[PDB]
Amino acid sequence: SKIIGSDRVKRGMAEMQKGGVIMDVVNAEQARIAEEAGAVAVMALERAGGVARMANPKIVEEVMNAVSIPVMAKARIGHITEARVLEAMGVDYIDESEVLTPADEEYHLRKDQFTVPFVCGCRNLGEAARRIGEGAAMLRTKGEPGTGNIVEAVRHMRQVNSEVSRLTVMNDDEIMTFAKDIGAPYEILKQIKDNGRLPVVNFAAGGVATPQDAALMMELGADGVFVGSGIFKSEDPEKFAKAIVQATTHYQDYELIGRLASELGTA
């Protein structure tokens, strides 16, 4: 028939997204550059100074009508009606983002009620498994957004990777208490060990600011790169985004990465 909303579709939308970089975008003209630079998707957003909300539907529609690649918008943590409004607009992905000020400091969104896939941040296997249990269809590292410092992205990626690698070879008798120790749903950990890998795609997000530490994320095991607004803080955002795409796709051609870094020259 038409099995719309099945978990396989939700997570396949992101599983056939790996290998590329999603750069965020403020206006239509930046989305043009992002599309023509090789981005696999754009993160439509509007902007320690106040309270961050959803980006106005007008600006999200402006970004949507300008590109043919998928556009994803950010919603507040646990904000039901915000995610519902973003779903009504046809947004391809909602980021239950901790970057925006949360709306429910205790309970996350009920992501399995929606027909639009969600992406959430994680710092260890516990948070990742909890987000998956709540219905998330994609994962990224929390990192340190707006700092250009890759330390937190590396830490979170390595932590979750080491924990899932431990679980893939962990005794069946010890899994339950393990789920009790990291505060994770037990059936999800059993499914992790059965499949042998993380049941969903985990991207890198946060301190990515150069092609070097963009290729480093793929070298470390990430499936893709979430890049912030630093692209449009350089002297040439077009060449910067192009170099980020090149370094993300060919993360082991070191002479290519060196040339791309030589071309760029900003903070």
Add this chain to the structure above:
Amino acid sequence: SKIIGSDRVKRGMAEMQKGGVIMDVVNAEQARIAEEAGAVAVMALERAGGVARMANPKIVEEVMNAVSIPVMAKARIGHITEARVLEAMGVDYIDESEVLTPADEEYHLRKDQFTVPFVCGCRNLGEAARRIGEGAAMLRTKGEPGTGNIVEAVRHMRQVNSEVSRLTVMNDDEIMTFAKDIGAPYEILKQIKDNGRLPVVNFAAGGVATPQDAALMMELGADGVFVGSGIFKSEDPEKFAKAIVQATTHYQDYELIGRLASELGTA
């Protein structure tokens, strides 16, 4: 065909056991009294003085061949081969009992690998849900065995009952973190809320020593009573067990309970 080992069979063996009392037994002649007194099953066992193990298979077979009601034996916590040996003997139920000295102070048994149903002790919804996730097919209160003090049985029963009643009417948005707070499998809590009751039978066990606090357990919401060796510590174990059966089945005929208590007269 022959769908043997399905979870429904495991937990139905105990679901069509509620309303009766299971008293433990040391030898065949005590099992005779237990059967002819109205017990629904017997707990075969051998004996702060040392380390408690499995009751010798010889004594378990002696108890088995003496009665037609189901006989259940106790195995050490996390003891794989002990539970396997009890399974090979055809024992109807294995009690992953904390009364015996544990064998794995960290990890419980992998109960879903066995084809024999298990019964485990619990003190709150967390431990109960963890035991269910590990594959337990029956639950009882930990209580205070060997003391005749009903305080702990009452406390555990009331705690688990209040927690499951809270979960039956708890918001769907709040369940996940709830499972994180009590350290319980999340899908099991969702199934609890969906079914509206505890997915398995919960008996009382511990301080039961008189017909009064045996009927009190049924008044509190328990489905049955686990009675220890105190029956054979009275002047007339036959009349004592008969009165316990009567008070368990008619836990609201207060004049009957009064007469039965008047008949008995020991510690």
Add this chain to the structure above:
Amino acid sequence: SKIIGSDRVKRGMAEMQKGGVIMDVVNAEQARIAEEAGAVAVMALERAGGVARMANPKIVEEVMNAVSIPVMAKARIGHITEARVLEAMGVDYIDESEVLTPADEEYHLRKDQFTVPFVCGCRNLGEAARRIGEGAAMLRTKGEPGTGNIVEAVRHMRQVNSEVSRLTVMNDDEIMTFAKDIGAPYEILKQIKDNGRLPVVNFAAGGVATPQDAALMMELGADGVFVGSGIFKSEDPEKFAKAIVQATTHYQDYELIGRLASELGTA
């Protein structure tokens, strides 16, 4: 020529020892029973009451001349001349045993200087790797000797097994600090990951007292069983040792284990 003392010979003496049980022995007549019961080796020893030393060479020679299976003796921790004297007598294995009162509370023996293989106790991958680095050619669990309580043996076995399983699939970038975290030689951890298994044989030792928890050790991943003097504390030590051998070799024939347990009947 005659490559005597090579590490492969030291650890092969124990690698072709797995699958059997080594029971300790006090006098020649107990060693007769141990040999004729199926033991793979005997632990010659003499005896919270004082200071434990080496068993008198006279009693070790008495045990040696009575059996054709290998005999191993216990030496104090870090006691150089004690291990040297045991080596001069031709003892097949020296147990740098924490059961005896240590001689060097800071530094263990320099085991790679000897031509006789050593066996040491461990509770985690750290202690095991440290003992291997010092030159140990065999490992056992510290457990709780003289208590009959299997809890500590289970805990140590599961801990070391889970840690080595984690290391076999651990990222190459993370191993070094891992060795820093558990206090282990780094090259030994690299060799563990390269070989895919623990580079030496790890036996169970301590709370083993029944055939059930003797087969449980093999079920858990142990390669063999170290049994204490409890064998000669029963009514029939011959049948007890025979049943321990049977349960160690066929640790998954549960009806056989049940019959052997039915035969035995002591504390």
Add this chain to the structure above:
Amino acid sequence: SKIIGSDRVKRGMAEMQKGGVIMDVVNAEQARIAEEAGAVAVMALERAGGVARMANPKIVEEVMNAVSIPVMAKARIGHITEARVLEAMGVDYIDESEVLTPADEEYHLRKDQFTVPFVCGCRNLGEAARRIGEGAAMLRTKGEPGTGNIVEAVRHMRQVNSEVSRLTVMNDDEIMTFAKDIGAPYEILKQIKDNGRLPVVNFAAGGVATPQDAALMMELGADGVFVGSGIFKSEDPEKFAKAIVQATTHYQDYELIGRLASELGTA
């Protein structure tokens, strides 16, 4: 044939570098001054104000094409692709530098995978042995870069020197736990005691700012001097660098050092 990448070549590149000073450099003309002043190598770099990264390959190539002496560049801690890009450019040495913002706050680089030798900072024998185990082919003191205060360089040099001198005469029985106490690979400590000296070259780095405390480093046991801002923050970098070279090579001609100090006269 062509045994390229052998550890002896890696560490010989630095072993035949001792006795001279490596001063860092920003642009080609400063590398000209460094070469014409007697420097044995230059440290190409670009710049508590932000996050420090790799120096742009363009500026590294500008420094490379300007001098015939070896040029070394700095990479972030644990930054795989950064060190790989510096390796692809032919840089003679990569400094896994703690001065730059790290990229992996937990795990250092896997230096033995590279064919280019690495230099790392250390403050005691523990850190030095850990860096050597990870594959470092040169060591320097962490010091206090950018302060001109020699206290930390003296402290680190004296600490590592006293610890290696202790290890050279330390009992063979006590080394293992020693490696456990300082958190160091045990085989590396055994190799240290066998060779009688540190298996690699240890330079001074940090508070070097005058010819006096540049000759003091050689007097203390250092094999060379890493100079940061001590030259390119004075009024006359040419004469300053020349005097530093002279004082480094003749660290015991005190009248010469006095004359060189009389010539110089800035902060």
Add this chain to the structure above:
Amino acid sequence: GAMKIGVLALQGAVREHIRHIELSGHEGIAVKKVEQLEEIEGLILPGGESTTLRRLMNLYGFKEALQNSTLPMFGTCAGLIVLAQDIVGEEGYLNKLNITVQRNSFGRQVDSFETELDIKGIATDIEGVFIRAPHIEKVGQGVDILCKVNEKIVAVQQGKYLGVSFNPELTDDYRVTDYFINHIVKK
């Protein structure tokens, strides 16, 4: 016997296509450089973002190398777009399939779906997953129409070229890659 099949590893679900190649009894090669094209006997253009894939192919000589290559090709979503001669609203890329294809014919991801597909010559119950999938608007001469959904065709085959709008690599059913390798590359 064991054939080496290449998957364009520039972007997209390359691991799934390599797994499905390994399920058919052959070896998979994730091709990122043009030289590797000389080592494979067949190429699979995997599912991903057609814009990113075009931008990556235009920058490493992949467009000229694949426009002149005599290698048989199997394009899924995006790969079908890359293989087409014409694209509604845009321009054709590799010009391998004499068809006109429109991108994102259905709704966005909130309108992606799964279904059963009866592909002519393969199977009657292929598990097709459509994720913002295109549809083939028009066919040329010599293009066999293998499968359509609501008069909108989604699976075609022209000689040694195979194009599908759905992504079979996301499922456990590997019959499409098996058919491609055994009846196109092996011909």
Add this chain to the structure above:
Amino acid sequence: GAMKIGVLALQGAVREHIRHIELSGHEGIAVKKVEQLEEIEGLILPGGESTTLRRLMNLYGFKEALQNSTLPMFGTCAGLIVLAQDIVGEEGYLNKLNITVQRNSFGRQVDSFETELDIKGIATDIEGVFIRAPHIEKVGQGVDILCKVNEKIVAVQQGKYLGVSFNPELTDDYRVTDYFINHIVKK
């Protein structure tokens, strides 16, 4: 083609023998019950404690089943002792090899060693490991003496039976098991 070879998994280095069987291109079966003897075409009596091995075989019908079995056998240390017809100081067990063997001819473990062995018909540089190994005192009619060490023979072959005093399973050299499977079981 792929032959199933059994290793007596009662006690001893069974994992090493199974690994060496897998290195020769065949499947290994760790036999613990008599019934499994009906599923293998060859048997390896692994190295271990001959006393424990005898006690285990005497208790599950293994002695009677193997004394009457027509299966070819490869005995290492202990296995050679079990296969012998006579044992100095004791009594013969399976009575398969017409030889007289003495247990623990060398010193104890403080006298175990490694060496190079030139086995007649296999290789000239077999890596032999002797761990309290026995030696064959006397041979009968029809017993080929394949290898001797210090005038004390340690490797013999009688028809479909192969006996060695050393343990090749502890090394990475699998030529002995390969020879056994390809020139004794395959005959």
